[PDB]
Amino acid sequence: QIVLSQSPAILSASPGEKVTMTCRASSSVSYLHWYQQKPGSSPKPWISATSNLASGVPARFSGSGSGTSYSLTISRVEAEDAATYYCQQWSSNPLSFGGGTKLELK
Amino acid sequence: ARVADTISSRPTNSESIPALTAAETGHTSQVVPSDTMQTRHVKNYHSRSESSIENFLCRSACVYYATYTNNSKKGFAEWVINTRQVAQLRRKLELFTYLRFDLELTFVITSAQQPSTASSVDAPVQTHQIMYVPPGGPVPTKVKDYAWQTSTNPSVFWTEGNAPPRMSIPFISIGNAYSCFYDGWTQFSRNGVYGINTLNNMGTLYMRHVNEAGQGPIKSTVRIYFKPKHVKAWVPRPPRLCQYEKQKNVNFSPIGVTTSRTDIITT
Amino acid sequence: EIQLQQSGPELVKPGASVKVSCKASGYSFTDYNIYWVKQSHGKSLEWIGYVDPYNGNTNYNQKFKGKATLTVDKSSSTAFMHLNSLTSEVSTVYYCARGGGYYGGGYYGMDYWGQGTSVTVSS
Amino acid sequence: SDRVRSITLGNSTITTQECANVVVGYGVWPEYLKDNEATAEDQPTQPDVATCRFYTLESVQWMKNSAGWWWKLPDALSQMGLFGQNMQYHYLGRTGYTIHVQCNASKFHQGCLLVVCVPEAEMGCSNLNNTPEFSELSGGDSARMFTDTQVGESNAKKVQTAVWNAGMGVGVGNLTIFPHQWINLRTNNSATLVMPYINSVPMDNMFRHNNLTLMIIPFVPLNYSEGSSPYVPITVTIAPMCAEYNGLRLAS
Amino acid sequence: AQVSTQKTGIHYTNINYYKDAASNSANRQDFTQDPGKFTEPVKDIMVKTMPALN
Amino acid sequence: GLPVMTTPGSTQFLTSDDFQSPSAMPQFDVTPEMQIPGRVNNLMEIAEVDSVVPVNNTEDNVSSLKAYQIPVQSNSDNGKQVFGFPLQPGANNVLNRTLLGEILNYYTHWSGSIKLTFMFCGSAMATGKFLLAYSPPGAGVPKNRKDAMLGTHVIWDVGLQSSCVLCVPWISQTHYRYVVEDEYTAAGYVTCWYQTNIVVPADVQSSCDILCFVSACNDFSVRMLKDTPFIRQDTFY
Ligand SMILES: CCCCCCCCCCCCCCCC(=O)O
Prior knowledge:
The structure holds 6 chains of a larger assembly. By secondary structure, chain E is low in regular secondary structure. Chain E is built from no helices and two strands. Chain E is elongated and about 60 Å long. The radius of gyration of chain F is 24 Å and the shape is elongated. Chains in contact: A-C, A-D, B-D, B-E, B-F, C-D, D-E, D-F, E-F. Chains B and F meet through helix 1, strand 3, strand 6 and strand 10 of B and strand 1, strand 4, strand 6, strand 8 and strand 9 of F. The structure holds palmitic acid. Palmitic acid (PLM) binds at residues 81, 83, 103, 105, 130, 132, 154, 156, 169, 172, 178, 180, 199-200, 202 of chain B. Residues 81, 83, 103, 105, 130, 132, 154, 156, 169, 172, 178, 180, 199-200, 202 of chain B line the site of palmitic acid (PLM). Chain B: One of its GO terms (biological process) is virion attachment to host cell. Chain B: This is Genome polyprotein.
C-alpha cells in the first residue's frame, strides 16, 4: 500500500518570491499528478505526470523530481493562487492522496 | 561505377506480381521500370563518381575567423577547435554518426590600416605566427611571453604577400571514430554536462603578430579552412531540419515539416 | 466541449439510501472509466472506486466495499452510484471524474471533474 | 508458412502468428568481441543464460489522441534481474538486443505504428540555454511520451516533445533510414528487430551512456466504431544477446 | 612511380614525396557500392515476383 | 640549379584541388580500425530507401502528423480525385524535404526513374480500387479519370498485400534535368483517382488513410555539387 506523505502542513509567502512544496511516497509510483482546489469549488487538474502543465496554467509553475521524492515549485508568487494543493499517485497499488498543503499570501 | 541498364520487356499475363508488395516488412521494393510496362533496351553510360563520400566531403570550408590588433597590449587571438560554429559544414558532417578522416588545414590572413595620427606612416611587410597547443600544455598570457618559444608545439611562420600556409594532420583521436553525436553525461552520477561537449577535447589555436608596432595600428584577420581526406563514414542519419541555436548542444525550436500549398490537388 | 453534469443536493435520514448521478456528454461514453471520490468538510480526498462502462467491471476501495454500488446505463450515457447505510460522518460532497483506464493509461490523470453533489444527514 | 515464427532464448519463448519478417540490424548478427579488437586485458564474464532472456517492460495504452513513446535501451533493463546486477558490479560491457513490440486488435480496428530503433539519439531541451534533466530523458521500464503540441519555453528543464520533429530537430518522416518495421492493424500483429552493438569504442560504460533509443509513434491514429473494445495496449519485450562485462568493483 | 586511369567521358603519373601516409592526396577513385544493408536488411530473403506475406 | 618557369595559376588557393602537403605531426600512430556496422560508401545508397511523403500540407497540417496522411473515404460520386502534385523532386515543396529531396538539393543535375510506394492503412474489411497515373508534360494537368487513363497508370487492388508501386519512368529529351524549377526541363504530374468505391461493412468507420513512400531506382545519379538553400546564419554559434 502506498502512503503519500505530503509536506509541509501549511505554507505562507509574501507576494513575489519562490516557494517549494514536496511529496514523498512509500515506494516508486508510475505517475504523479497535482490538483488545485479553491475552497468552495471542485478540484481542477493542474500539473500531471510530474512535469506537464495543464491547459490555461500560467508558466510560473513547475514540477520535477523522481524516485521517491517529488516537488512542486512556483517561480514568482502571483496573487491568484491562494488555494490548497493535493497530490495523487497512479501505481499498481490502488490509489492514494496527499493531504492538501494550503498556500495563503503573507 | 556505371549504373544498371534497362532490358526490354514483353506483354505478360501471369501469376507473377512484381508491383504488389508489403511495406510492413521494413524492406524497400526492388522493382525496375521494365516490370510494370513495356520498355526498350538502352545502355546507360551514366556514372556515380560525383556522389561518393570522398567526392562529397573533400572540399575546403570556412570554420572560423578571428581578429587581433598590433598596437595593443594582449592583442592576440585564441580559438578552441571545434567544427560546430558554422552552419554549412556542421550540417554536412551530421549526415553520419561516426566519421574517420585525415585533415588538411589552410589559413588566409589579411590586414588593414587603422586610424593613427602620425605623419607619413609607412610600415614594412608583416609576419605572423600560428601556434597550436595540445590540451595540457602552457598557454600564452601576453604578446611578449615565454610560451611562444614553441620548443615542442608546432607553429607556422608566414610573411604577407606569399601563398597561404598549408599542412596535414592525421586522425587524432582517443577512440576509433570521430563521434558526431553523444547520448550521455560526463560524470557517473548523471549530473552536469550532457551531449557532445564531453567528447570535445582537441586543443587551442593561438595567433599573434611578430613585428612590433612601429607608428600605426594594424588589425589583422585569419580565416581557417578544413578539408577532410581519406574519409570513412558509418551509420547514416537524416538531415537537420530546424535551424541551429547553440554550439555545445542540439537545442532547437519547432517548425513545420514543409512549406505549404492551398489544397491537396493544387499543382 | 467535454462536460460532466451531476444531480442536485439532497438530505437523508440515518439508515437510509440515496442514488447520485453523473451524466456525461460531449464525447464517446464507453471509451473512458469514471472514478468516484469524496471530499469531507474538513479532511482530504478519498477514493471510492471506479466503473468501466463498456463491460461493467466495478472495482472498489477496501473501506467502501459493501456500502457503495456503482452501475451504468449505456443508452443514456449516465453513471449511477447507490449508497448503502448512510451514517453520521457523511456530511460531505461526492465527485465524479473521467479517467483513462487505470495504470495502463493514466498519463493525463483525472482530467474532467464534475460539480459535486453535497449530501447531508439530519432529522 | 511465412507468417509464423518462434524465438527461443534462455528459458523464454515468443510465439507469433501474424508477423512480417525479422529486420537484422545493418545486415549483421550480434557476436562476441574478437581478440583483434579488444583493449581491456583481463578476462570478461559471460553468463549467457542468466542475462540473455526476454524481459517484459510495462504496458501503455494506445488512446485516440496519443502522440508516441520512447525508451532508452541500456537503461530500461537496469533493474531487471541479473542483467541489472551485472551492470552495477562491472565497469564496462557490450550487448546486442532483440526487440519484439506486440500490439493486437480485431479486424474492425484501424491504425498504424512506426517502430524505429535509433542509435545515439541526443535530445534537445525546451529552454534554449540549458540541457534536460536525467529524470526526464529516461526512466526505468517507463515510457516517456511525446506531445501533439509544443512545450512552453518558460519551463526550467524539459525535453521538447513536439512529435513532428521527434525531439532531435529532424523531419519525422525521414526516420525510416534507421532499421525499422511497421505495425499495421490491417495486416500485422507484431514487429521484431535484431540490433548489433553499434559504438565508436569496443566497450562502454552502461550507466553514463545510453547508446540506443526505441521510438514508437502512430502515423495513422487508432479508430473504431462504437461497440468495439476501446482498450488497446502495447507491450515491449527486450532480450539481450551476447552480453559480456569487464572490470569488477563495488556496487554503486 | 605509378600510372593510373585518368577519369574521362589516357594516363597520369604520381610519386609520393613525404614519409607519412596522412600527407598523401585524396583518394577520389574509390568506387564501391553495397546498398543491400540499407534497403534489404531482412533475414528471410524475398523474391521480387513472389508475394511477400504468403 | 635546374631552370624552371612558373606558369599562371600559381600561389593561388582553389578550394577543390588536392596536392600533397607536409604533415604537422610526423610519425604519428593512429588508433587501429574497427568493424562498425553500417558503412556508407556512396551517397546514392541513402537516397534509395523509402521516406514518407507529406502530400497533405494544406496550410495547417504541416505542424502536425496530418501532413503524412491522405484522406480516403467511402463517397458516392465516381471518378473523384484523391491527390495530385507536379514531379519536381528538388523544387516542389511536397518532395522537397524527403530523404531523396534533401540529397538532391546538394547537386544540380539528376537522372533516372523514381519509385512511389503506397500503403493502405485502413480496416481489414475495407475493399477498394485506385488508379495511380502519371502524365508527361506538354498538355496541362489531367482533370478527369478519362484524361488520366491515357498516361502511364497502374490499377491497384486492395487486398491482403497492402502495397503497390507506381514506377515513374525516365522519359526526357535530355540526359539530365535541373534540380531547380526550370520550364525547359519540366517532368510531368502525378495523380490518383477512385476506380471503384471503398465498400465497407456495418460498424466499421468509413474514413481511412493512405501513406506514401518515395525512393530512387537502381539507375539514379546526380552531378555538379553545390550548396544547399535550407540553412541560414547571422553570427557564430
Ligand atoms: C599549426 C598546426 C595546427 C594543427 C591543428 C590540428 C587540428 C585538429 C583537428 C580537429 C578535428 C576535429 C574533427 C571533428 C570533431 C567532432 O566531430 O567531434
